[PDB]
Amino acid sequence: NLNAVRETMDVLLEISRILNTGLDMETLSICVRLCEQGINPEALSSVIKELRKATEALK
Amino acid sequence: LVHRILPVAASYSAVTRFIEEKSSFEYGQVNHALAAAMRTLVKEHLILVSQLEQLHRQGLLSLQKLWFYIQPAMRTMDILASLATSVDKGECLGGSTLSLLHDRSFSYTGDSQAQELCLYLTKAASAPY
Amino acid sequence: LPARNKILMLSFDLRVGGLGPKADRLEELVEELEAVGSVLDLLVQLAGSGPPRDYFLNNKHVGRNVPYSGYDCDDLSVFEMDVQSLISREECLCHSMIQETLQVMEAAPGTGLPTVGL
């Protein structure tokens, strides 16, 4: 199963790349560790959409 | 008034001669980043001159306006004509220049026009060290 | 509403805009994604809000054998878009290179140096 979770982490990368999400590998690793707890993803939407917004507000 | 504007070019002549000499290896590996942060400042001067050229073609650059423009930049360019002529004189490399340039931000701590340049120049000269 | 169905609904939207084999790879992916589920529900809310040749396409002179498919000769016009996207990138570059430096050759004075702002 330890080999399987690595393969499922690598198959998970492409659908976060081709859907034009805000995630790359690091945010994927953070968010996959957060989702294993049981945290609601509809709330994580806003914290990612605001981390990417607040830097553009400074420029 | 020309004699008041004329020290700018004299405080430019021994700044390009800083860039085109202090880029050499022999002056050390601190004079490299020293003269890549005195190269940036000469590019800033080149930006100013271009804007003023666009003004002058429309009959809209005159001696008074130019004199107003350059007066903040005689606390910018003339400062470069002093550090260049103290670091080059004698043999100053590495840490000896960097003490001499920590000595020259306590000779500019009340102007604030020159002080920003001193802080930038010694923030670039501290990087290889 | 399942998890693997939500990837299929966007496979369709892949297939609308061309790119057949990309959707054909996606459907090879959906059988192993569910024969982690809470991540893809995060992927649909970020779907399109993020930050922004080949010798096997229209050639038939390679291969140990080729299937014979007759004349088509109306995909040679979308082999010109295959080049047109390249040369329209290399002219958009030249528009954003003349702009960023004519904006510094011409501006109000005192805005190209913040030390003159003091």
UniProtKB/Swiss-Prot annotation, chain A:
Cellular compartment(s): Cytoplasm, Cytoskeleton, Microtubule organizing center, Centrosome; Cytoplasm, Cytoskeleton, Spindle
Disulfide bonds: none
Coiled-coil residue spans: none
GO CC entries: centrosome; cytosol; gamma-tubulin ring complex; interphase microtubule organizing center; spindle
Location (main, coarse): cytoplasm
Biological process annotations from GO: gamma-tubulin complex localization; microtubule nucleation by interphase microtubule organizing center; mitotic spindle assembly
Keyword Cytoplasm tagged: yes
Sorted UniProt keywords: Acetylation, Cytoplasm, Cytoskeleton
Source superkingdom: Eukaryota
Assembly notes: Associates with the gamma-tubulin ring complex (gTuRC) consisting of TUBGCP2, TUBGCP3, TUBGCP4, TUBGCP5 and TUBGCP6 and gamma-tubulin TUBG1 or TUBG2; within the complex, interacts with TUBGCP3 and TUBGCP6 to form a luminal bridge with actin that stabilizes the initial structure during complex assembly. Interacts with TUBG1.
Function: Required for the recruitment and the assembly of the gamma-tubulin ring complex (gTuRC) at the centrosome. The gTuRC regulates the minus-end nucleation of alpha-beta tubulin heterodimers that grow into microtubule protafilaments, a critical step in centrosome duplication and spindle formation.
Family designation: Belongs to the MOZART1 family.
Name under which the protein is recorded: Mitotic-spindle organizing protein 1
Gene from which the chain derives: MZT1
Region of the whole protein represented: 17 to 75 of 82
Curated annotation (Swiss-Prot), chain B:
SS bonds (residue pairs): none
Subcellular compartments: Cytoplasm, Cytoskeleton, Microtubule organizing center, Centrosome
Expression tissues: Ubiquitously expressed.
Documented effect of changing residue 39 to C: In CDCBM15; uncertain significance
Highest rank taxon of the organism: Eukaryota
Binding partners and assembly: Component of the gamma-tubulin ring complex (gTuRC) consisting of TUBGCP2, TUBGCP3, TUBGCP4, TUBGCP5 and TUBGCP6 and gamma-tubulin TUBG1 or TUBG2. TUBGCP2, TUBGCP3, TUBGCP4, TUBGCP5 and TUBGCP6 assemble in a 5:5:2:1:1 stoichiometry; each is associated with a gamma-tubulin, thereby arranging 14 gamma-tubulins in a helical manner. Gamma-tubulin at the first position is blocked by TUBGCP3 at the last position, allowing 13 protafilaments to grow into a microtubule.
Similarity-based family: Belongs to the TUBGCP family.
Function: Component of the gamma-tubulin ring complex (gTuRC) which mediates microtubule nucleation. The gTuRC regulates the minus-end nucleation of alpha-beta tubulin heterodimers that grow into microtubule protafilaments, a critical step in centrosome duplication and spindle formation. Plays a role in neuronal migration.
Disease (UniProt): Cortical dysplasia, complex, with other brain malformations 15: An autosomal recessive disorder characterized by global developmental delay, variably impaired intellectual development, speech delay, facial dysmorphism, microcephaly, and varying degrees of cortical malformations including pachygyria, thin corpus callosum and subcortical band heterotopia. Most patients have generalized seizures.
Name of the protein in question: Gamma-tubulin complex component 2
UniProt source species: Homo sapiens
Section covered of the full-length record: 259 to 387 of 902
Swiss-Prot record, chain C:
Subcellular location: Cytoplasm, Cytoskeleton, Microtubule organizing center, Centrosome
Superkingdom of the source species: Eukaryota
Subunit: Component of the gamma-tubulin ring complex (gTuRC) consisting of TUBGCP2, TUBGCP3, TUBGCP4, TUBGCP5 and TUBGCP6 and gamma-tubulin TUBG1 or TUBG2. TUBGCP2, TUBGCP3, TUBGCP4, TUBGCP5 and TUBGCP6 assemble in a 5:5:2:1:1 stoichiometry; each is associated with a gamma-tubulin, thereby arranging 14 gamma-tubulins in a helical manner. Gamma-tubulin at the first position is blocked by TUBGCP3 at the last position, allowing 13 protafilaments to grow into a microtubule.
Disease per UniProt entry: Microcephaly and chorioretinopathy, autosomal recessive, 1: A syndrome characterized by microcephaly, cognitive impairment, underdeveloped retina and choroid, and epilepsy in some patients. The more anterior parts of the retina, near the periphery and pars plana, have a grayish hue and diminutive vasculature similar to retinopathy of prematurity. Visual impairment becomes evident during the first year of life.
Family: Belongs to the TUBGCP family.
General function of this protein: Component of the gamma-tubulin ring complex (gTuRC) which mediates microtubule nucleation. The gTuRC regulates the minus-end nucleation of alpha-beta tubulin heterodimers that grow into microtubule protafilaments, a critical step in centrosome duplication and spindle formation.
Name of the protein this chain belongs to: Gamma-tubulin complex component 6
Residues of the full protein shown: 64 to 195 of 1819
